[model samples]
Target: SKTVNYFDIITIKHQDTDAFLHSHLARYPQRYEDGRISSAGQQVTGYTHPDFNNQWEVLPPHGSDVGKGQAVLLNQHIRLRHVATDTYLLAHDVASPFYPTNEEITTVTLEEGDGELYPETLFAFQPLKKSDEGHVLKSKTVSFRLFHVDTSVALWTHNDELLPDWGFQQQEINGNKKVIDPSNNWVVDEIVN
Candidate 1:
């Protein structure tokens, strides 16, 4: 007998400055494409709040008067496959938000760029074989790890591959390394049926 199968891809969008950093600055070379000056024309590509201090502990001396332009082009790709059969599962674009959470929910605010907030969608895929579609399948979430090409700051994950064996050391938090557990952060209860 032939049967129909249904699957859904759900995304829970959250605000993360590191995600913004990975999307904008992580993959680019330290020097500009021109390859002459070191920091000149080095665009501030990642998330920053009006009040958030840089590692230098001071606002960019440029005084927030920079022009809006494409400083770098990031080539990102995502793939999902079943481990048992080694078959491709799904592929999708990951969306990232600009400016830190504080800027959006706090007193500090920053100006938006022309195409600052970019949203990526998953590549479409449909089941092929009828039996494959109807068979019960088990799945696991693969977390993606982002690293700065120069600084090597790894920021996010939903899986344990990147920092395996030290999973306990890997905790999700903001750029400031603040503990972001449910006790400290906001929480909501679900209504059970």
Candidate 2:
């Protein structure tokens, strides 16, 4: 669901949840060329695994395993840190200085960023409290909505599409559809050392 916040990207708008795939980048070894994991520049099925034709390997922002990242509750804010990438999950307006129509999620290199990281970078994790199966609620950060503090847009996805060559940080899409669809729902697992 679209978990909006009080803070505004000066006051912009955004958009959902739905059934998507849970595969990660490590699953497909062929997706890697030199070093960094690569998206196949193809549409994801989100329902099956493909290695031959139309090969699609979808890696979620976070994983169920440990060590990759962790979502910590820092003064009512969900701060995500990808230790491997050495970056922080910072959500802000994707539409630059001119177009402030939407917002999205991006990771900022905090290796040299001392106090430059603040609440504007942190996300508000909101649980949908909806049923996952014939059961109850799951992990607090595992399955929930990420609200962009800037534009009030939900850190969303349309049916688990990998943003077309990691386009989430580079593209501009008017994501005002499917407020509570399965596509926007994310599962960010915690890591323990």
Candidate 3:
């Protein structure tokens, strides 16, 4: 199996529905939920089919770097920048339109003053089993979860619902408070780096 390395261009496929984490030029339609307005960041959805939009580059946290070819290990803090849009995937306190109880997942293009305190951008590659903790993450073979560093939720999606037309009706990608569920697992389908 191929070991995932920092800066590796990878496609993450949800184990529950085999959909790829995807995003495109579409911006989230402005809406209000739980007395808060949506950030209207770029829409991040689950695409059942493969495309360049499904690609993301794994990177070390802000102000950090990993040498070329360094294997990405489980439990290591990281960030994923959508390869197509250069936006970082994030989950914030804003509630999702459909799953209000969970955090809304979106992609934001950071600016100079965005500040690293946007800890919502940080996630840890977590082994599915405790015994496999700290294992090297291997492409196509390792099943893991992207555990949100700030909210302690898992990056997640499912087939039960599709997003509105603005999102092209793709499966909605959001945070799952039920972090330990089987629906939260994902696998690295490719390492394009």
Candidate 4:
């Protein structure tokens, strides 16, 4: 079900780079052409605008001017369908190359075609901190967590893989130290509109 809106059209920033998570059909068929679509897949590519030749913009329908472009509200437990390609941000099906012990995260167009979310499409949001920047929708300054509830793993970002990009994974936060790792933490930055 849909939850309350915070900042609808926004970019997920990689804490290490200042670069944001972007989507696009930029490079398909892989460089070696290993038929890796579902393997390499549409994991959100970590990149910055201006530098990237062409990149997909991931946002909800009816975007905010203060958010990204025209976007929709990111409700807790709801599927985040991209405004452009109309796919849901998905996990569980993507191939995990970096960490064999972790679950992979990627996007899929399952909802519009088949209708309804499965374990891969469903995620619950938990806001950890607010910007304290007052009511500026553009700076919806929020830090939060995304959990693949059924699997009981938290959405995480690691900097070690992806030959030329960065993607997310559902890493185990089952222990004390792993739960507090900085790699697992993400800050949803300024509402672009």
The clash numbers for all candidates, in the given order, read 2, 9, 0, 10
* Superior candidate under lDDT, 1 versus 4: 4
The all-Cα superposition gives candidate 1 an RMSD in Å to the true structure of 19.3
Query: What do the candidate models score in CA lDDT, each in turn?
Result: 0.19, 0.34, 0.84, 0.43
Cα RMSD for candidates in order: 19.3, 12.8, 2.0, 8.0
Model 2 C-alpha lDDT per residue in residues 163-185, reported as the tens digit of each score:
33433222222222234654455
lDDT of 4 by residue, 34-55 (tens): 4333344454545545333112
1 or 3: which has the higher lDDT? 3
**Per-residue lDDT of 1-193 in model 1, one digit per residue for the tens?**
1111122122111122221211111121233333422211111122222212111100111223323321111112222221222222111121111213210100101221112211111111111222333233211111223212122222222222221121222222221112232222110011111
In Å, residue 20's CA in model 2 sits off its true spot by 9.1
Tell how far residue 65 is off in model 2, in angstroms. 25
Query: What's the true lDDT of residue 72 in model 1?
Result: 11
Best by lDDT: 3
Which residue runs of candidate 2 sit more than 4 Å off their true CA positions? 1-75, 96-101, 111-114, 129-137, 140-143, 159-182, 189-193
The local distance difference test score of model 2 is 0.34
- Could you tell me the TM-score of candidate 1? 0.16
Q: Output the worst ten-in-a-row residue range by lDDT, candidate 4.
A: 168-177
Q: Each prediction's TM-score against the native?
A: 0.16, 0.42, 0.92, 0.57
lDDT of 3 by residue, 1-193 (tens): 7889888999999997999999998887678533566778778889999799999998887677568888889988888888889788888887776787888888777661146645778888888888887799998889899888889999888777788777788998888888989899999998886
The best-first sequence of candidates by lDDT reads: 3, 4, 2, 1
Residue range with the least summed lDDT across 10 consecutive positions in model 3: 109-118
**Model 2 Cα RMSD, Å?**
12.8
